[PDB]
Symmetry: C2
Subunit: 188 residues, 2 copies
């Protein structure tokens, strides 16, 4: 009866956009797997923080399905996500089974690369807007967090807490999200 | 002419309170050393995120002095910091040379353990107030960020961005902090 989250961690990922959702989701009792795109080896993030994943993506793929798949941002991290066939397969499968897909900052550009959720309203970091909107396959929003159907997007490192709590609310409900939020000393 | 920051990373540290200042400080061009209290081995943080430090504290101690020493929170992390003689030596030396000391959430309780900055106004996580105030050696504040002399404290994971930008402002000035803040998409 425990919900499960998959966080895909690639070289160049924004480490704040990775750690905040992982931390907050585990505070919510969600079982989170931080999966390395390239294997189990440590991952050097965009600002040189080195994180050890819980598993390779290859192994985590076999222990699905996941209630949410989370794509952190970081320009180079998102490019690596966009180029990976393994990510394409995971996202398409998640879209087919109507599971939640969450991406932040530059992360949503991987959805375009893999043709995921076309027709949805999405947000990105302002600097990633042009890339996300190439072709007009989505409708753009400037909301700090945006949720359209099963696609949940957010804008940047400074929206990471709101992004993570939106995932908790979607998975575990509004009361758990509120309980988890209080000890964090968030402003609003 | 490059400013230097030492971040002391112990088992049980709050990983969000570690990664956010490290990331933000490096965005500000500060040279940050994430030093493992127990050595160079990977550190399991409070919510099971595993971070690889840049160096052992023993080695980083020899490459001082640092313009700021940063103590993340996390209840068990702060206890480990409070019990370490190596941390005591580093903090006393930093206090003597009038360098900045920054601590967040439960981190400030390590200052009391090592008799650092008595008489200063400080804040902590609400749950750490009683521990910090044992003996009445500080004056308590409920401000999200508090700076008194060379002691800079903050309340919790949700104040981590404000905490980190206060360090940048103290070290690099108000304009650099403002430049670093804009791409983050912080609310206020």
């Amino acid at each position: 009866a425990s919900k499960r989250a998959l966080v895909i961690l690639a070289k160049g990922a924004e480490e704040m956009e990775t750690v905040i959702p992982v931390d907050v989701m585990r505070r919510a009792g969600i079982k989170v797997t931080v999966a390395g795109l390239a294997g189990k080896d440590p991952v050097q993030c965009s600002r040189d923080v080195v994180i050890c994943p819980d598993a390779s993506l290859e192994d985590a793929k076999k222990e699905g399905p996941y209630d949410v798949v989370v794509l952190p941002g970081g320009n180079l991290g998102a490019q690596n996500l966009s180029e990976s066939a393994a990510v394409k397969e995971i996202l398409k499968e998640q879209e087919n089974r109507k599971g939640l897909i969450a991406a932040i900052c530059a992360g949503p550009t991987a959805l375009l690369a893999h043709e995921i959720g076309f027709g949805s309203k999405v947000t990105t970091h302002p600097l990633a807007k042009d890339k996300m909107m190439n072709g007009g396959h989505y409708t753009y929003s400037e909301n700090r967090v945006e949720k359209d159907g099963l696609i949940l997007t957010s804008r940047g490192p400074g929206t990471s807490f709101e992004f993570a709590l939106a995932i908790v609310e979607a998975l575990n409900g509004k009361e758990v999200a509120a309980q988890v939020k209080a000890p964090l000393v968030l402003k609003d």
